[PDB]
Amino acid sequence: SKLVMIFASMSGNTEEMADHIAGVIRETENEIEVIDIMDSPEASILEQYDGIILGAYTWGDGDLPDDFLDFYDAMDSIDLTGKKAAVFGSCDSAYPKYGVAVDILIEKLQERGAAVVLEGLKVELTPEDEDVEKCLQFGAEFVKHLS
Ligand SMILES: Cc1cc2nc3c(=O)[nH]c(=O)nc-3n(C[C@H](O)[C@H](O)[C@H](O)COP(=O)(O)O)c2cc1C
Ligand SMILES: OC[C@H]1O[C@H](O)[C@H](O)[C@@H](O)[C@@H]1O
Numbered sequence: 001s002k003l004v005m006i007f008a009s010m011s012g013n014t015e016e017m018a019d020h021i022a023g024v025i026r027e028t029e030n031e032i033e034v035i036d037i038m039d040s041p042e043a044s045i046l047e048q049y050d051g052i053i054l055g056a057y058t059w060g061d062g063d064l065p066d067d068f069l070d071f072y073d074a075m076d077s078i079d080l081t082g083k084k085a086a087v088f089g090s091c092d093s094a095y096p097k098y099g100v101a102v103d104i105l106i107e108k109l110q111e112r113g114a115a116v117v118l119e120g121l122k123v124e125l126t127p128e129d130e131d132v133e134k135c136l137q138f139g140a141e142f143v144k145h146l147s
Pocket of ligand 2: 076077078
């Protein structure tokens with residue numbers, strides 16, 4: 001199957017997660033294209049994949065990264081019925097609205113018809129060894145749900 005991952009990372013923590021998850025998936029007989037939101041992908045590309053993984057830190061007052069806002073708006077005009085999807089991100093418990101970018105992106109995927117196949121994966125700040133193992137489990141479980 002043909003998969004896309006679109007991630008946002010300012011200080012590298014969500015990027016580390018993305019690279020682990022994608023590297024695990026690449027060891028299966030599935031293709032994955034990993035795109036940084038800073039490179040401005042158009043949301044319509046999500047219609048052309050079998051599975052979709054989004055990664056995002058949380059910003060401001062429980063908000064999406066600024067660089068995700070246009071893409072998020074454009075998601076209201078795409079049809080993701082049938083696709084399999086999941087979301088991850090780095091988080092900080094010094095904020096009350098912890099990791100809610102993950103929850104916001106899950107909600108939008110649901111509204112557009114995607115089958116969200118995993119709970120949101122939230123890691124505090126920089127992954128430690130156990131968090132990297134959770135990234136492995138997330139990639140492995142995502143693949144199981146494909147066909
Ligand atoms: C201005 C600012 C606002 C933030 N807002 C939140 C927030 O509401 N909730 C949260 O969990 N983290 C929040 N964070 C923490 C970041 O999500 C956290 O540092 C994360 O590890 C960044 O991931 P990254 O390294 O991929 O950029 C905020 C950080 C900054 C600088
Ligand atoms: O693409 C726009 C339309 O897509 C789907 O029909 C949604 O269910 C509907 O709410 C939205 O207005």
